Scaffold this active site. Structure first.
Site, PDB file in Angstrom:
ATOM      1  N   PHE A  64      39.073  34.046  50.480  1.00 49.65           N
ATOM      2  CA  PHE A  64      40.339  34.134  51.197  1.00 49.65           C
ATOM      3  C   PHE A  64      41.050  35.413  50.803  1.00 49.65           C
ATOM      4  O   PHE A  64      41.342  35.625  49.631  1.00 49.65           O
ATOM      5  CB  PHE A  64      41.223  32.926  50.890  1.00 49.65           C
ATOM      6  CG  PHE A  64      40.751  31.664  51.539  1.00 49.65           C
ATOM      7  CD1 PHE A  64      39.663  30.982  51.027  1.00 49.65           C
ATOM      8  CD2 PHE A  64      41.379  31.173  52.676  1.00 49.65           C
ATOM      9  CE1 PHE A  64      39.212  29.817  51.624  1.00 49.65           C
ATOM     10  CE2 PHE A  64      40.931  30.013  53.285  1.00 49.65           C
ATOM     11  CZ  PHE A  64      39.845  29.336  52.760  1.00 49.65           C
ATOM     12  N   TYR A  69      46.113  40.727  49.254  1.00 55.94           N
ATOM     13  CA  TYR A  69      44.775  40.481  48.716  1.00 55.94           C
ATOM     14  C   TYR A  69      43.643  41.111  49.526  1.00 55.94           C
ATOM     15  O   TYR A  69      42.521  41.228  49.032  1.00 55.94           O
ATOM     16  CB  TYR A  69      44.529  38.982  48.511  1.00 55.94           C
ATOM     17  CG  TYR A  69      45.144  38.470  47.236  1.00 55.94           C
ATOM     18  CD1 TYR A  69      44.468  38.582  46.028  1.00 55.94           C
ATOM     19  CD2 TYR A  69      46.411  37.899  47.228  1.00 55.94           C
ATOM     20  CE1 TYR A  69      45.027  38.131  44.851  1.00 55.94           C
ATOM     21  CE2 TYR A  69      46.979  37.441  46.054  1.00 55.94           C
ATOM     22  CZ  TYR A  69      46.279  37.561  44.866  1.00 55.94           C
ATOM     23  OH  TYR A  69      46.829  37.113  43.688  1.00 55.94           O
ATOM     24  N   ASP A 146      37.072  33.407  44.521  1.00 55.65           N
ATOM     25  CA  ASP A 146      38.277  34.212  44.690  1.00 55.65           C
ATOM     26  C   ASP A 146      37.911  35.649  45.040  1.00 55.65           C
ATOM     27  O   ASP A 146      36.858  36.151  44.638  1.00 55.65           O
ATOM     28  CB  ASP A 146      39.105  34.199  43.403  1.00 55.65           C
ATOM     29  CG  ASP A 146      39.892  32.918  43.224  1.00 55.65           C
ATOM     30  OD1 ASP A 146      39.805  32.032  44.097  1.00 55.65           O
ATOM     31  OD2 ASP A 146      40.600  32.797  42.207  1.00 55.65           O
ATOM     32  N   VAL A 147      38.795  36.321  45.766  1.00 49.26           N
ATOM     33  CA  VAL A 147      38.513  37.667  46.248  1.00 49.26           C
ATOM     34  C   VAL A 147      38.854  38.755  45.226  1.00 49.26           C
ATOM     35  O   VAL A 147      38.309  39.859  45.284  1.00 49.26           O
ATOM     36  CB  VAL A 147      39.284  37.964  47.543  1.00 49.26           C
ATOM     37  CG1 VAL A 147      40.757  38.220  47.233  1.00 49.26           C
ATOM     38  CG2 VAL A 147      38.674  39.154  48.263  1.00 49.26           C
ATOM     39  N   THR A 180      43.273  21.112  30.454  1.00 51.05           N
ATOM     40  CA  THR A 180      44.514  20.966  31.227  1.00 51.05           C
ATOM     41  C   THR A 180      44.322  20.164  32.535  1.00 51.05           C
ATOM     42  O   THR A 180      44.817  20.548  33.599  1.00 51.05           O
ATOM     43  CB  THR A 180      45.166  22.340  31.535  1.00 51.05           C
ATOM     44  OG1 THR A 180      44.195  23.211  32.135  1.00 51.05           O
ATOM     45  CG2 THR A 180      45.698  22.989  30.239  1.00 51.05           C
ATOM     46  N   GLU A 238      42.574  22.955  41.599  1.00 48.40           N
ATOM     47  CA  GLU A 238      41.703  22.954  40.430  1.00 48.40           C
ATOM     48  C   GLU A 238      41.730  21.596  39.698  1.00 48.40           C
ATOM     49  O   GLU A 238      40.706  21.141  39.179  1.00 48.40           O
ATOM     50  CB  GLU A 238      42.058  24.109  39.486  1.00 48.40           C
ATOM     51  CG  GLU A 238      41.206  24.182  38.233  1.00 48.40           C
ATOM     52  CD  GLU A 238      41.524  25.417  37.415  1.00 48.40           C
ATOM     53  OE1 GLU A 238      42.394  25.341  36.525  1.00 48.40           O
ATOM     54  OE2 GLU A 238      40.910  26.471  37.680  1.00 48.40           O
ATOM     55  N   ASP A 261      37.103  37.239  32.444  1.00 51.72           N
ATOM     56  CA  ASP A 261      38.132  38.271  32.523  1.00 51.72           C
ATOM     57  C   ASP A 261      38.118  38.999  31.202  1.00 51.72           C
ATOM     58  O   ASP A 261      38.609  38.489  30.192  1.00 51.72           O
ATOM     59  CB  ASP A 261      39.520  37.676  32.796  1.00 51.72           C
ATOM     60  CG  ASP A 261      40.606  38.751  32.957  1.00 51.72           C
ATOM     61  OD1 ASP A 261      40.463  39.863  32.394  1.00 51.72           O
ATOM     62  OD2 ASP A 261      41.611  38.474  33.647  1.00 51.72           O
TER      63      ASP A 261
HETATM   64  C1  LIG Z   1      42.856  32.470  31.330  1.00 52.75           C
HETATM   65  C2  LIG Z   1      43.296  32.192  32.619  1.00 52.75           C
HETATM   66  C3  LIG Z   1      42.586  32.674  33.710  1.00 52.75           C
HETATM   67  C4  LIG Z   1      41.431  33.420  33.515  1.00 52.75           C
HETATM   68  C5  LIG Z   1      40.734  33.905  34.611  1.00 52.75           C
HETATM   69  N1  LIG Z   1      39.581  34.592  34.503  1.00 52.75           N
HETATM   70  S1  LIG Z   1      39.079  34.978  36.028  1.00 52.75           S
HETATM   71  C6  LIG Z   1      40.361  34.224  36.815  1.00 52.75           C
HETATM   72  N2  LIG Z   1      40.591  34.152  38.200  1.00 52.75           N
HETATM   73  C7  LIG Z   1      41.750  33.461  38.798  1.00 52.75           C
HETATM   74  C8  LIG Z   1      42.475  34.455  39.705  1.00 52.75           C
HETATM   75  N3  LIG Z   1      41.587  34.949  40.778  1.00 52.75           N
HETATM   76  C9  LIG Z   1      40.446  35.623  40.116  1.00 52.75           C
HETATM   77  C10 LIG Z   1      39.665  34.661  39.216  1.00 52.75           C
HETATM   78  N4  LIG Z   1      41.151  33.699  35.882  1.00 52.75           N
HETATM   79  C11 LIG Z   1      40.993  33.707  32.229  1.00 52.75           C
HETATM   80  C12 LIG Z   1      41.705  33.228  31.135  1.00 52.75           C
END
Ligand SMILES: c1ccc(-c2nsc(N3CCNCC3)n2)cc1
Ligand SMILES: c1ccc(-c2nsc(N3CCNCC3)n2)cc1
Ligand SMILES: [Cl-]
Ligand SMILES: [Cl-]
Lengths: 280, 290
Positions: A64, A69, A146-147, A180, A238, A261
């Protein structure tokens, strides 16, 4: 297609698997319900590639890209061409409110892109709706992501299976009490602190088109009843994805190699590869 | 039944899987084509029992008890009642030339025994017979078919953890061996031929199974291959086991059973890699064999 029966492979030469050598000594590679947890070192991609090629496997990939975005599309698509299901048929589905903003990207043979003209509740609903309208006839497996991401390394047929979820990078080493999940019994997404296998991230799931349709419809319906009761689950779709996968055990689980990330979480030793990562 | 859908489970309380703790550090628990290799410690039987029970899974178990081998039936059946798929539906199929010698044994609810009264050698006959009876009966009567030797006893749990579209079992003599040491048929003239640079595992002919349709395909393929060998006056070095190995080389099993599932302690002792000896060979003159 997805054939009912085992594929008959040609002669192939590759290193013999070693029964008395674990493939990983540092991580869990199979769930207690005997589903593989996919880490580098667990699979021979040449064997898997041949198995899936013989069925002429087609993989759909949804993203999306709304509002600002759309800016992530070019990098997402260029890197997908380099790393996503290379050698196999791919159909990209780009949901967007700005079709004219979709970048022109050169696609490999057997790969194609459709633009679908158009919040988390809606994403689940829309995926399910378009499964019924077209994905069911057009692809064999559907992968939803996710994009705002880029492929940095191989993401291929090793992930394909009737239903898969991906370990959330924040929780893969956490006890279930720390996950969570939604914790109110009033919510359809409720999971108490003595239940739970893993915490899956909403940003990367998939499976056969029919199982993905079922998951996304169930999540949408659960969100609707929650709403009628004045309830919004703590982490929206989620939370519902997690409840669904608790009760319907995935047939593969992807390690955090598949959703990372690096800026936020660095690079722990258990990750031999970073395949699919957030873009700053 | 086997459903075309993910089964939905109720609330269950069990130990959380721990991503950063391997379930086994001493053995391979997943094949390179991502099929589980089943060892004690890899599975939670509570979860698997529930998945299969909610689908009302029925498991067929075939044995050939010809001539003097009928003497093994009582021990085989009585131990299967104690340890084989307990809590699930089971249909025993006893292939025999002596229907009257089949022992009277008390069976649990949902467990049934059928007696099947029985130009080619015996191993060919066994593959042919299983394949033929898949068509005649098994396809309509059971969800999974498991094919084993009768001169065996169940000493410990053998349950739904093994169930999958197609499985073979690691041969106890070879689980630690390199492919070059495997006693595959090595003559290129045989349909069972596997050259020295190929092979994943050496599977034992005494324990394999899967969905009825996959077992029908396997047994038919093996029988057809044996008939081609027969035409050429070739008998594969280990008969049906040689052909089984060729088939499972080209059609990868969706689970592989460790040697816990097929063992002979008198011959091989009890290596540390085995937490349980589940299903074991019975000596010819065992006190329960009459
Ligand atoms: C704590 C919280 C989130 C992340 C996290 N890594 S990738 C990601 N996403 C969500 C947003 N869109 C792209 C994919 N989120 C890592 C550590
Ligand atoms: C070397 C050779 C054979 C074995 C061996 N274990 S069980 C078994 N069988 C074949 C006879 N029927 C019952 C199952 N055979 C072990 C080591
Ligand atoms: Cl419940
Ligand atoms: Cl040899």
């Amino acid at each position: 297609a997805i054939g009912e029966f085992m594929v008959s492979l040609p002669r192939m030469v590759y290193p013999q698997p070693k029964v008395l050598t674990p493939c990983r000594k540092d991580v869990l590679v199979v769930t207690p319900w005997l589903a593989p947890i996919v880490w580098e070192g667990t699979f021979n991609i040449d064997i898997l590639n041949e198995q899936f090629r013989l069925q002429n496997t087609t993989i759909g990939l949804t993203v999306f890209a709304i509002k600002k975005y759309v800016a992530f599309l070019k990098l997402f698509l260029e890197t997908a061409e380099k790393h996503f299901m290379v050698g196999h048929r791919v159909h990209y589905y780009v949901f967007t409110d700005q079709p004219a903003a979709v970048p022109r990207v050169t696609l490999g043979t057997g790969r194609q892109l459709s633009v679908l003209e158009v919040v988390s509740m809606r994403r689940m609903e829309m995926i399910s709706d378009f499964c019924e309208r077209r994905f069911l006839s057009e692809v064999d497996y559907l992968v939803c992501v996710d994009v705002d991401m880029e492929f940095r390394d191989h993401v291929g047929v090793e992930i394909l299976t009737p239903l898969f979820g991906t370990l959330h990078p924040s929780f893969y080493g956490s006890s279930r009490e720390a996950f969570t999940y939604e914790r109110r019994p009033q919510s359809q997404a409720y999971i108490p602190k003595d239940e739970g296998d893993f915490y899956y991230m909403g940003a990367f799931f998939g499976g056969s088109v029919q199982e993905v349709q079922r998951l996304t419809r169930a999540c949408h319906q659960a969100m609707m009843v929650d709403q009628a009761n004045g309830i919004e689950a703590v982490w929206h779709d989620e939370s519902h994805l997690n409840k669904y996968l608790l009760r319907h055990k995935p047939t593969k689980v992807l390690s955090p190699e598949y959703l990372w990330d690096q800026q936020l979480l660095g690079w722990p030793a258990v990750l031999r590869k970073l395949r699919f990562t957030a873009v700053p």
